[model samples]
Target: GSHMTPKDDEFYQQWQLKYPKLILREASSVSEELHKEVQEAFLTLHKHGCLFRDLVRIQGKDLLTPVSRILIGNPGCTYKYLNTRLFTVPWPVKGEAEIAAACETFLKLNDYLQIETIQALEELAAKEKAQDEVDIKSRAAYNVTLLNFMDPQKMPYLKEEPYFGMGKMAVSWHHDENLVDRSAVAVYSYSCELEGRDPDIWHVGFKISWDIETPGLAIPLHQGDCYFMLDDLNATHQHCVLAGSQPRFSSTHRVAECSTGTLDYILQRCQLALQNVCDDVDNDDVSLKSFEPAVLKQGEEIHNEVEFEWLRQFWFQGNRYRKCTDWWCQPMAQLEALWKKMEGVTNAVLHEVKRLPVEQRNEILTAILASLTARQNLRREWHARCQSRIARTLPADQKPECRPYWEKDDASMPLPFDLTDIVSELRGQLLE
Candidate 1:
C-alpha cells in the first residue's frame, strides 16, 4: 500500500504517471561456473582498493555498510548520496580480466535489457504524462552499475560495533536520484544469490513520495533480476534492501544522465566492453537502444546563483562542521569567509557589470576572475592547515579525486567551494 491519504494519493498517482517502477529477470543465463569466480574476484579486488571511498559512513563500519559497494560503469558517470558523490570508472581479462569481464557482460546485456524489459514502464510514464511517443523496442542505456555486496557469514564487520546486531545486515534507503540533474532514468539490480533459493532473508522496501513520512512496499528480489523505475519515479519513490545474515551480493545499474553528444565516445568503449565478457554469450536477441550519446546530456546545469544559494545554506549557515572531513577540522566560518564576501559584493558587482558598456565585459570578467582566485586560495589554505598532522610529506598530492567541473583543479584533488566556478559562470551570464 502507498500509505498515502486520499489527498496525497492524488499526487502519488500523478507522480507514478510521471514515473513508473518495475523489477525484471534476465539473470538465469548466469552460469554456476561464472558465479563462483565472480565471488572470488570482488573479495580479491577489495584488497586492491576497490571498495567505495570512505568519506561516507553509515551505522559504523564502512565494511558492514548496509552493503559493500564498488562503482563500475562509464568514467565521469556519477551519482550522489547525502550530497556527496559516487563516480563510475572503467574495468577485464582472466583473473583481474575475468572479474572485469563478468561485470561488463552484465553491463552490456543490461544495456539491452533497458529497452526489452522496461518498455511497459516507459510507455506508461509517457502515456500518463501526455503526448510523447514511446521507444518500445529499444535497450536501456544504463552506463552506471553500483555494485553492492551483502554477506552475513562475515557479519559483525567489527568485533565490537555500531548499529544493528550479529548476522544481520541491511543496505539503507535513498532518493534513487530524486530531482537530481545527473539522475538515472531506469535501474537494474542483480542478486545472483537469490536466483535458486529465494528467501525472506533479503527483502526490498519502498516508499512512494506521499508515503515518504511512512513505509510503503516491501518485496523480495531474486538473482539475475532486472528492475526499473521509469519516468522520474525514483524522485517520487525510494527503495532499499533489508539486512539478513545470509551471504548475498547484488548490483544496481542505471542509464546515467543523457549522453547525447558523446555517441562515438560511448560506442568506442562500450563495444570494447562487449568484447570482454564470459566466453559463450550471444547478443543476437538484444535490441539496439534508441538514443545516441556518450552519456545523456547533463540535465539543466544549476546556475551559479542557485549554486551560491546552496553554498549559503550548506556551508555558510551555522552548520559549518558539515564540510569538515580532514583530521584537522577547519572552522566553518573561516571556510566561508570568502563566500560571505562574495555575497556582500554580488549585487554591487552585478550592477557594475550590467551598467558598464557591453564591450567592457572582458574587464568585468577579469575582475571577477581575480577576485575568485584570491578567495579560493583562502579556502584552500584553510584546508591545508586544518590537518591534525601533515603526513611526513612533500608533494602531498594525495586524496581521492571527485570534484565537479567548477572545482577545475588538475594538480591536486578538489575540496569543494572553488569560488572560481561561480565567478566563471557569473562572468559568462553577464557577457550574454
Candidate 2:
C-alpha cells in the first residue's frame, strides 16, 4: 500500500496538491442566527439526554476519563475507540428532538473541518476576551458537546487497527472512526469568554506517507467559524483537538450508519435501563444521591471515592457557570475548604473500610442494604434537618432568581450537590 501510482515520477511533481485546503474562514463569517440555533439545540440535548460522562476504562473500573462525553443517537448506535464503546442514549424528549431536528436542518446546508490560517489562529487566541456559545449537525448523528476535558496523562497514541502504512501509525493522532461525522463534515467552534479557549491542533503525523512526508500544521479555529473536512480528508489526515482547562464546545459530524429522524431508539434504551431502576434507584444520571447503592456495591472497599469524585467535578467543572459570576453569593473559598475537610475524612474512611475484615464489612454493608424498607427512616432525619434550614432562611424576596440552597435539585443534583459538610454527616454513619 505504501507504493504509489505507476507514475511515481509525476506524483512527486505535484505532491503538495494532496493536502486538503482549510474550509473554515474568519470567525465573523458565521451568522448570529446560526450561532443561536446551534446553542439552543446542543443545550436541549444536554438537558433531556446527552448528559456528559467520563469515558475511560482502567483496571476494570470505569474511571473518569477527565473529559466528559455523552453519545446521542438511536439504539444499536454507539461511539467507540478500538474495542471500547460508549453505548448511545437516544434523544427522547420532544423538545430536544425538535431542537435537534431544527439544528440539523440548518447544518445540512454546510459541512468537513480544518483550520483557516496560522495568523488567524493567533488572533482568535489573543482576541479581547468577551463572548459566547458552541454544537449542531448530520443525519449520521452529530455528537454535540459544550464541554472540554482532556487527559493530562494521556496521549494521541494512534488508534490501534489491523492496517498497514503511516496513515495507520499514529504520532498522537487518529480519525473519528465512525462517530460524529458526515463524509462532508462541518465543525463549528464557539468563543470562550473564558470557557472556549483552546486552539485547534491540525496535524501531527508519523510515517503518514501519501506519496509524501506529512507536514504538521498548528492552526487556531475562532469562534463562529466553520471547518469542513470533505471527502476522505479526515480519513486521510490524522487530526487532534488541543485541550485547555477552559471550556470549548464543538459540533462535529460525519456519515454514521443509523436510522435517522425518530428518537425512539433512546426511549427503548431507557426502558431497558428502567428494569433495573427500582433495584438501583440511585443510578439516575443525577450524580449526588447519598443513598445511591451503586456507590455502595458488593465487595467495595469505600463509597466515599464516589463522593469525592462528585465533589471534585462540581468544584472544578460543574459550578463554573462562566460569565455569571454573581450567579451566587456563596463563598467559594469556604465551600472548597469544606470540600477538602470532607475529602480528607472520606479518604480516612476509605482506609478504614479497607482494613476491616471482609465478613464484617459485608455484614455492615448488607445491613445497610437490607434496610430497603427503612430507607424512609434513614432519610427522615436528614430531610427534616434540611427543610428546617431552608424554611428558616426563607423570606421570599422580590428577586425570584435568588433561590435558597435547598430550593434546587434537578434530579438529585442538589444545588451545591450537597456540599453541606458531608464529612461530618457520614463519619458516624459509615464506620460501623
Candidate 3:
C-alpha cells in the first residue's frame, strides 16, 4: 500500500523548500511506545495552547506560540514548512474536533505572530544590541576630519590599522571591522565639479566594505552585486552602477537646495513608516468621525473660557489664596459647570426618569448618547486639525496621502487626518 498521498507528498516538497529541515514521516503503523510518546507530545502542545490563551487574556494582547513566532521572525518560512518541516506530521490527528481546535489555535497564533510577536522580538533584539554597544573603545586617535565636505588630512586615520581600534579586546568594545570610510575622501578628490548654471552640479564616489557576519551585508559580497546611488532628494532619478569598486555620486543642474528642511521631511517619512508598520501589525484603520475638525474648535473654545476665568481669578485674588492651592480645582470647576449646564438641558427635555414616561426617558437617554457621540466626533476633528498642521510642515515629496478615504471639500483641500482603513478601524474602536 502507498505510504503517503500525492497531496501529502506535494505539501512535503513545498515545506522542504521553505524550512531548513527534512521531514520523513510515513503513514505506517508505529510501535506502542512511539504511539504513547506522540500522545504525550499532543497533550503537552494542548497545555501550551491553554497557557497562551491565559497569557493573551491577562495582557489584553494576542500572543503567538514559539512555532508561529519562529515562522514570522523568518519571513521566508511558509505554511507548508510550518506543518511538514516543523511539525513533521498532521497535528491533532486523533479526532475531527481535535484537528479543528488545533487548526484554530495555529491560525490565532500565526495572527499574533504577524501582529505583535515578531515586532516585540525585533524591538527587544535592537534594544539589547543598543545596550551592548553603549561604549566602544578606539585605539587610533580619530577625529571628525571633514565637517560637511571632504578633508584629505583625515584620510590616513580612515582605514588605519586595527580598523581604527575596532578590534580592541574589551568585552563591550565591539566594533565593525568592515567599516566604510565616511570622511568624504572620495567626495572631495574624485567629485565632478559643478559648471556655470542656475544651480550647481557635483559628483562623488566611495566604496563600503562588506562583512560576511551580517547577512544583509552578504548581498554586496557577490562580485557583481554592489549597489550605489546619489544621496540627494531626487535620488530616485539618479542612476545606480553595479559591481563598482566605489559608489559614484553626481550632482546636476537641477537645484542647489540645502537639505535642512529635507532632513525633517525624510525623518517624517520614517516616522510615518514606523506608524504604518505598527498599524499594519495591529490591523488598525483611520477613523473618519475622529478626523472631523469642528470638535477641536469647540474643545478649544471651552478650554479658552476656563483658562480666561482661571487667569482672571489668579491675577486679581493672588493675596487672598494661601500657599499650595489645588491645581486640579480649575479642571474640576470646568467639569462641574459643564455637567450642570448639561443637567439643566436634560431636565428641560425630561424632568426626571420617574416623572417622564418610559418612552420619553428612553428618548432623552438616546439624545444624550447622541450628544456625547457628537462631542466625541468633535474631539476627533480637533486631533485631525493638529495632525494636519504637523503634516503641512513636512516635505511635499514625502507627505503621506492625507484624506485617504474620501475627497475633501475645496475649503478643506489639504485635510490632515488621512490614515488608512486599518487605522480607521482602530480609531472607531477607540471612539466606541
By TM-score, the candidates rank as 1, 2, 3
Q: What is the lDDT of candidate 3?
A: 0.24
- The Cα error of candidate 1 at residue 258, in Å, is 6.5
Q: Write the per-residue lDDT of candidate 1 for residues 36-94, one digit (tens) a residue.
A: 55555545555443453223323421221445566566533445443334434353212
lDDT at position 203, candidate 3? 16
Tens-digit lDDT track for model 3 on 1-432? 011112233434433332111111121322344333333333433344311100011132222111111111111111111111110112222333443343333332223222222233344346547732211111111111110112223223222112211111101111111111210001111111211111111111111223212111101111111111111111212111112123211101011121211223323333332321223322222211221224323332332232222322222222111111233244334443432332222222322333535454454344334434443454354334324544345343323232112244533222222324323433443454
Worst 10 residues of 1 by lDDT: 293-302
Score every model by TM-score. Answer: 0.48, 0.36, 0.14
lDDT of model 3, residue 371: 39
Prediction 2 global C-alpha lDDT: 0.37
Local lDDT at 308 for model 3: 25
- Which sections of candidate 2 miss by over 4 Å? 1-16, 40-50, 57-63, 73-77, 82-172, 179-182, 194-213, 259-432
Better of 1 and 2 by lDDT: 1
Compared with the true structure, what per-residue lDDT tens digits does model 2 show for residues 52-73? 4432334534333434444433
